[PDB]
Design a protein around this ligand. Sequence first.
Ligand code: Y18
Length: 125
Amino acid sequence: SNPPPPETSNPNKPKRQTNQLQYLLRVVLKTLWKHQFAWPFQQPVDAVKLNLPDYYKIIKTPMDMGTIKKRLENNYYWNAQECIQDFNTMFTNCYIYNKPGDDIVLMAEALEKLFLQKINELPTE
Ligand SMILES: CN1C[C@@H](Cn2c3c(c4ccccc42)C(=O)NCC3)CC1=O
């Protein structure tokens, strides 16, 4: 009914950290996760429960911070850009599905503002 949970662990992928991946987990994710607006974004959108039966028709690639958090904890990302893309996909999804001015879009905008500020201080590759 809902799409399967996105993959958060990669078998046979070696454990490798980078400065940027460390920053994305220990600074960026940590700051966004504790924000008062984080909660709609802490797990996949359950469009069946939330009565959004057109959501998956519009959103071909769902993404959320719970998935990102698990991916970072599991060292699923090969590089920081994959993780940054997941954050960007999450925000884009919100902006192309919901009416501007709806609470959820205002919440996404506040989280993205903080995200982009932290990304301005991303360590150089
Ligand atoms: C990440 N999500 C959550 C989904 C459910 N949803 C919506 C609002 C909303 C507000 C607070 C929690 C969930 C909310 C809102 O303002 N207008 C309608 C949609 C839509 C979406 O893209």
